[PDB]
Amino acid sequence: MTVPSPLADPSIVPDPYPVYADLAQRRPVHWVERLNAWAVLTYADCAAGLKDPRLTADRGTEVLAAKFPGQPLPPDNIFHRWTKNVVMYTDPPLHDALRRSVRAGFTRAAHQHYDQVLQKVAHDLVASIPAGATEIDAVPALAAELPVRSAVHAFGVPEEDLGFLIPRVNTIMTYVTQEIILEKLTDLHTYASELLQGMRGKVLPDTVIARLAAAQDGLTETTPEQTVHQLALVFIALFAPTTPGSLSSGTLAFARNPRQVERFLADQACVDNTANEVLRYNASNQFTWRVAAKDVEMGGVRIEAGQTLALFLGSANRDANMFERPNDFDLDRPNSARHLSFGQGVHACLAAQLISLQLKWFYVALLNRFPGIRTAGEPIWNENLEFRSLRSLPLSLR
Ligand code: HEM
Ligand SMILES: N[C@@H](Cc1c[nH]c2ccccc12)C(=O)O
């Protein structure tokens, strides 16, 4: 518990992969004092961790009370009420009722619709770059924008309410006091309940939110108050840096791998594999958290009940045991769907197919219009490994 580890250090964020690979061979499970947690680096251990019912997702407190040390919250506090009433931070059986209660947004029919919507939104965004522009900053120009367009057109966040929502989510997601974070989370609840009453903006028809709103008369195993808590989670997830990071990191991968641009243009199987290879290549959420509900042993280490674990999805995704030549961006890779960037099992990302559709249709539009993308200077990363995202991606278009 006293052995130094570089895993919480912003210095590794530009390229964490060699650090992960070095430490994995030596100390695949080890203590990271700045995370107050056991790091778990290998694919096999992360996948087992995500499936292990000895590891609870009820971890909101452990993980906040880390970020704002000695800052003990009264109960009734909204963070506790929220975490206890959303899928992300609950265990079965309640988790499962919570997840079923949002199914209407995510049916097979719904995704057939979102496929069409996202094709068009991505096409239109890329088309709005003038053909003769020679350079862009792909982060603000594209990766920041497509998730917002998706939030409006596929999820049904009213356009007119983005000024309310995005800055609040950005404040929540900051790498700003505990009080402020609870204020913004309170505001997201107020917004969610008012949105469903018709007091905020207009929800577009056939969107995720319209479907969830139409499902409310039929609740059987969850409450109206839990719908409000879960919609506050959805807003955070929608405007989190996760989707921008996926879009930008994958754009960088294509810019540095012209041969894969060629493969994408040549072969529909490579197009179909693009979202998963992009997701594997750089997990936006490079680690997720668990608490040990019972003692477990992983990587030779006895982890005691109550201790926190950080499951390094980003490391897992570049484990050569699972992915031969893991550091190659390879659209021909046969098992890219085994990545852990959306988790696995009980908590696997609710939006996984929505996100893969967004990614696919973005790269279809981008590489058809601007096959010659290349970096125009060194990319600049952020400093937060947990939600890792490019800050700037200067790109030459031709
Ligand atoms: C590239 C973008 C995204 C990435 C990389 C991502 C990643 C993840 C990961 C890693 C998990 C599992 C967490 C764990 O097991 O601890 C997860 C869960 C979840 N994601 Fe996403 N996500 C993204 C976008 C979104 C969006 C836009 C939404 C909006 C609905 C969303 C909603 C959720 C929800 C609700 C859960 C919890 C599901 C449950 O607990 O049953 N995600 N996501
Ligand atoms: N990894 C986060 C959960 C998470 C996954 N995807 C997200 C998107 C936004 C916010 C949180 C998340 C946690 O352990 O707390």
Nearest to 27 by CA among 297, 316, 300: 300
SS3 sequence of 347-380 = HCCCCHHHHHHHHHHHHHHHHHHCCCCEECCCCE
The SS3 of residue 164 is helix
* Lookup: tokens for 186: 């309170």
Residue with tokens 């390229």: 15
CA distance 197 to 194: 5
Spell out which residues line ligand 1, taking CB within 6 angstroms. Answer: 87-88, 99, 233-234, 237-238, 242-243, 246, 284-285, 288, 313, 341-343, 347, 349-351, 355
Strands, E assignment, the chain:
29-32, 37-40, 55-56, 135-137, 288-292, 296-298, 301-303, 308-311, 374-375, 380-381, 390-392, 394-396
Q: Which atom of ligand 1 is nearest to the CA of 346?
A: 41
Q: Which atom of ligand 2 is nearest to the CA of 57?
A: 14
Q: After which residues is the chain broken (C to N over 2.5 A)?
A: 175
Which phi-psi region, left, alpha or beta, contains residue 337 (left: φ > 0; alpha: ψ -120 to 50)? alpha
**Which run of H or E residues covers position 181?**
helix 178-196
Query: Which of 339, 308, 393 is CA-nearest to residue 67?
Result: 308
Answer for the pair 321, 43: CB distance below 8 angstroms, yes or no: yes
> b vs e for 182-193, b when ≥16 Cβ sit within 10 Å of the residue's Cβ?
bebbbbbbebbb
Return phi, psi of residue 395, to 5°.
-130, 130
Q: Which residues pair with 395 in a beta bridge?
A: 136, 375
> Rounded to the nearest whole angstrom, what is the distance from the C-alpha of residue 202 to the centroid of ligand 1?
25
Q: How far is CA 350 from the centre of its chain?
A: 10
Contacts of 388 (CB under 8 A, 6+ apart): 13, 16, 245, 282, 283, 284, 286, 314, 381, 382
Which structural domains are found in the chain, ordered by start? 1-398 (1.10.630.10)
Q: How far is CA 117 from CA 129, 205, 368, in A?
A: 19, 12, 19
Which residues lie across from 290 on neighbouring strands?
A: 309
Measured from the Cα of 345, ligand 1's closest atom is 15
Q: Which residues of 198-227 are buried (b: 16+ CB within 10 A; e: fewer)?
A: eebbebbeebbbbbbbeeeeeeeebeeebb
Going by the DSSP 8-state scheme, the letter that residue 337 receives in this structure is G
Structure solved via: X-ray
Residues ≥6 apart with Cβ < 8 Å to 195: 158, 161, 201, 203, 209, 231
> How is residue 202 annotated by DSSP?
P
DSSP string, 67-91: HSTT-PPPTT-HHHHHHTTSGGG--
| Cα gap 171→169, rounded to integer Å | 5
For residue 147, give the ligand nearest its CA: 1
| Closest to 76 measured CA to CA, from 67, 85, 68 | 85
242 Cα–ligand 2 center, Å = 9
Measure the CA–CA gap between 9 and 85, rounded to whole angstroms: 32
Long-range CB pairs of 162-168, under 8 A, 24+ apart, other chains included: 164/191, 164/200, 165/191, 165/235, 165/239, 166/239
**210 and 203 in contact (C-beta within 8 Å)?**
yes
For residues 120 and 154, the answer to whether their CB atoms sit within 8 Å is no
Ligand 2, atom nearest to 289 Cα: 14
Please give, one letter per residue, the 3-state secondary structure of 53-73.
Answer: CCEECCCHHHHHHHHCCCCCC
- Choose the residue to mutate in 350, 353, 387 for probing ligand 1, maximizing ligand atoms within 8 Å of C-beta: 350
